[PDB]
Amino acid sequence: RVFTSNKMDEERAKRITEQRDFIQARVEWKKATISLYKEWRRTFLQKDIEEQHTK
Amino acid sequence: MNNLLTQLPKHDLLKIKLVRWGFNKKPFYVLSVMKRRQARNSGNRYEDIGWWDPSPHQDGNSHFGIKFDRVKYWLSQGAVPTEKVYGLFGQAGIIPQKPAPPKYKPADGNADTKWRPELQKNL
Amino acid sequence: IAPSQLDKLEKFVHVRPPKTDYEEDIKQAISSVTDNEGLKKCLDLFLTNHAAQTWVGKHEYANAGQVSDFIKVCEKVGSSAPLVTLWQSAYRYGVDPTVPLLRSSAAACAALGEGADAALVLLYGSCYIVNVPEDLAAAVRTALEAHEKAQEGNAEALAKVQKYREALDRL
Amino acid sequence: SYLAQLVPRDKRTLSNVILNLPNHGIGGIFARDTWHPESKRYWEILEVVTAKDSSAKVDAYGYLYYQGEKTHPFPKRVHSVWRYGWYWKPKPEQEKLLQPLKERYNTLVDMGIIDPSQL
RNA sequence: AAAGUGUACUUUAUAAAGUCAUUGUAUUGCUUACAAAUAACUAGGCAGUUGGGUCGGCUGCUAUACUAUAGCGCCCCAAGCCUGAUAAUUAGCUAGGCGUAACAGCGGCAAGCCACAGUAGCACAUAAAAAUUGCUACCGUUAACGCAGCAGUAAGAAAGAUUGGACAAUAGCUUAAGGGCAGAUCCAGGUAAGCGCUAAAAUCUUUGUG
Ligand SMILES: [K+]
Numbered sequence: 001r002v003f004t005s006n007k008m009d010e011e012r013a014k015r016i017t018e019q020r021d022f023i024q025a026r027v028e029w030k031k032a033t034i035s036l037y038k039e040w041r042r043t044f045l046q047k048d049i050e051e052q053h054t055k
Numbered sequence: 056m057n058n059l060l061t062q063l064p065k066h067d068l069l070k071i072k073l074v075r076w077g078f079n080k081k082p083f084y085v086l087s088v089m090k091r092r093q094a095r096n097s098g099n100r101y102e103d104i105g106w107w108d109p110s111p112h113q114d115g116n117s118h119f120g121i122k123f124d125r126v127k128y129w130l131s132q133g134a135v136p137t138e139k140v141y142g143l144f145g146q147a148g149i150i151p152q153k154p155a156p157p158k159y160k161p162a163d164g165n166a167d168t169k170w171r172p173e174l175q176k177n178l
Numbered sequence: 179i180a181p182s183q184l185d186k187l188e189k190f191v192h193v194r195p196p197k198t199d200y201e202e203d204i205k206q207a208i209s210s211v212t213d214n215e216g217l218k219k220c221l222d223l224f225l226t227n228h229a230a231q232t233w234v235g236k237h238e239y240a241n242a243g244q245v246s247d248f249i250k251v252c253e254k255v256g257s258s259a260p261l262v263t264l265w266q267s268a269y270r271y272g273v274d275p276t277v278p279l280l281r282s283s284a285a286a287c288a289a290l291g292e293g294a295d296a297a298l299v300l301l302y303g304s305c306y307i308v309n310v311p312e313d314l315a316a317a318v319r320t321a322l323e324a325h326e327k328a329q330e331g332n333a334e335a336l337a338k339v340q341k342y343r344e345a346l347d348r349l
Numbered sequence: 350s351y352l353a354q355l356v357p358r359d360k361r362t363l364s365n366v367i368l369n370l371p372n373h374g375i376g377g378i379f380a381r382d383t384w385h386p387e388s389k390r391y392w393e394i395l396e397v398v399t400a401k402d403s404s405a406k407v408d409a410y411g412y413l414y415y416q417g418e419k420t421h422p423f424p425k426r427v428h429s430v431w432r433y434g435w436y437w438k439p440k441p442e443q444e445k446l447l448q449p450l451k452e453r454y455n456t457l458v459d460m461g462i463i464d465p466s467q468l
Numbered sequence: 469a470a471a472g473u474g475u476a477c478u479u480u481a482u483a484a485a486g487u488c489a490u491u492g493u494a495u496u497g498c499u500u501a502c503a504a505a506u507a508a509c510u511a512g513g514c515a516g517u518u519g520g521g522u523c524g525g526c527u528g529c530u531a532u533a534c535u536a537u538a539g540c541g542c543c544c545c546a547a548g549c550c551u552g553a554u555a556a557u558u559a560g561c562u563a564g565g566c567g568u569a570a571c572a573g574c575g576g577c578a579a580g581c582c583a584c585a586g587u588a589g590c591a592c593a594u595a596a597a598a599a600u601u602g603c604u605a606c607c608g609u610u611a612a613c614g615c616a617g618c619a620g621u622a623a624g625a626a627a628g629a630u631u632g633g634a635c636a637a638u639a640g641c642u643u644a645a646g647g648g649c650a651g652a653u654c655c656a657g658g659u660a661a662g663c664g665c666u667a668a669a670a671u672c673u674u675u676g677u678g
């Protein structure tokens with residue numbers, strides 16, 4: 001669902017502003033976590049390769 | 056007996072969940088890696104990773120234990136924490152805090168008494 | 179369902195096209211109409227013809243030749259409401275507003291004696307034509323005077339005539 | 350009257366606006382009332398085809414402009430025809446020519462001869 | 469794939485995004501072995517039965533392996549296969565659990581696997597799916613229904629709880645406008661497992677008065 005209004009008043013402006021901030025914050029948060037997961041993923045893969053060679 | 060699962064789900068997601076292990080009005084939680092669609096306290100798990108005691112002690116703090124190395128391993132594989140687990144990891148500094156959406160609904164005026172008839176009898 | 183892209187619209191049109199030519203039906207309908215109900219049917223026929231032409235690709239005033247015939251039938255029948263509706267929605271019916279058409283409609287209403295209808299047609303016509311002839315205005319004024327005399331006994335008619343006279347004077 | 354399409358009205362789909370205009374409103378500018386007036390959001394109509402059966406609804410094709418710039422590469426049909434709030438936006442040349450006509454229409458509405466809600 | 473792509477959809481004088489559709493290096497796996505109650509007043513069992521050959525065994529779209537589960541099915545060919553077999557009685561299994569120095573014996577609690585939803589045969593549903601999906605016949609009440617979902621009623625039995633409150637928390641379904649749904653669950657009521665405390669006052673507890 002979305003919010004739309006024919007009246008160009010303060011209430012309409014507030015809803016648009018709040019939504020923009022939330023979406024921007026969530027997008028930035030997603031990028032940071034994924035980068036951490038990718039970095040950890042490489043580390044564990046390297047350990048497995050070393051263990052396999054030892055065996 | 057409770058052998059841990061090894062094969063990953065093919066049609067569902069893995070999540071990090073809280074399991075209720077308390078007593079009457081004395082909650083206690085255990086963190087484990089389980090299939091998304093299951094019973095709350097089901098015995099099917101991939102690993103148990105931590106514990107949490109939400110109530111304050113004489114020192115005024117809550118206590119939380121976690122495996123730092125294994126949390127990263129499962130987060131890399133694709134396990135998705137729930138909303139409350141995100142809060143615990145955010146405060147503990149394992150991952151950045153997750154922003155919450157704005158709230159407009161008038162909050163509940165009876166949250167600790169609405170679901171407890173014993174208090175309402177005295178009220 | 180209509181295609182999303184405009185480049186595929188030609189194929190959509192050619193498949194099962196609807197009936198488009200209604201000139202023969204309208205000509206027969208105009209002659210056969212002798213009551214108000216038939217006049218309403220003709221108005222619907224005009225609307226369907228104007229809408230149907232888009233399938234062929236024409237966007238002109240299809241109902242530009244039979245307008246005069248429709249006016250004649252309405253005057254003979256004696257009902258002016260169909261003409262009032264036509265001028266109110268002239269574009270929707272595919273009729274191009276022009277001074278000769280306005281004069282013909284006003285004369286028909288004036289002949290019927292409905293000065294109030296004559297004022298309505300002139301007022302609606304003024305919204306399509308920038309300049310209204312002064313002679314036409316005088317004719318409508320005479321029609322209003324005749325209408326007032328004919329129906330002087332009805333207070334509601336007197337109020338309507340007075341209101342229309344004020345509108346004509348203001349505009 | 351076609352002059353009644355300038356002010357948006359409740360339960361007024363784009364089909365009613367397009368039909369009650371000269372030449373089916375080809376080459377005109379239309380927009381919804383929920384869009385900000387200064388946002389420069391509008392549709393430019395290039396082709397119109399009526400419904401096969403109803404003959405009272407229209408499928409329109411054209412371009413979509415946001416901030417006075419095209420948003421898509423090729424013409425496409427308007428998918429929001431069925432929504433409400435559409436109104437006519439005459440170009441400056443049309444506005445100048447229609448100045449006296451708008452005044453006449455407003456006077457008639459003020460005096461109660463014309464009821465915009467019915468039309 | 470916590471991904472990419474779009475002549476697609478929605479919101480914006482503030483825009484980042486999501487929605488819908490589609491896409492994976494072979495595009496969702498079969499087989500074998502061992503163990504697990506009585507039981508001979510059950511001694512013969514099996515003929516698609518044991519093995520071999522051709523053909524079939526579909527839902528495409530890397531290349532070879534000479535066709536790469538199978539008597540799984542048709543036709544043909546050779547006579548083999550099992551023998552505490554075959555037929556019966558009883559029981560859901562694992563395990564926590566209770567007695568015992570142990571060995572053994574028996575099977576209330578948390579959880580895992582399997583089967584079923586009045587009875588039986590079928591269609592979908594393959595890969596994670598039929599209490600609250602269909603078709604047919606039958607049984608019991610009255611064209612319909614089947615509470616072995618929660619509460620509750622009747623009969624039977626020595627003996628089986630309220631026709632309660634709430635989504636505040638945990639888990640789940642949907643949704644980018646921050647909401648909606650819920651007898652899972654969390655709380656209360658009822659019933660002498662068990663565990664803890666009270667059933668007497670004392671300078672109005674000197675952890676006091678000031
Ligand atoms: K059955």
Ligand SMILES: [Mg+2]
């Ligand atoms: Mg049994």
Ligand SMILES: [Mg+2]
């Ligand atoms: Mg059955």
Ligand SMILES: [Mg+2]
């Ligand atoms: Mg199920």
Ligand SMILES: [Mg+2]
């Ligand atoms: Mg039953």
Ligand SMILES: [Mg+2]
């Ligand atoms: Mg029951």
Ligand SMILES: [Mg+2]
């Ligand atoms: Mg929730």
Ligand SMILES: [Mg+2]
């Ligand atoms: Mg007793």
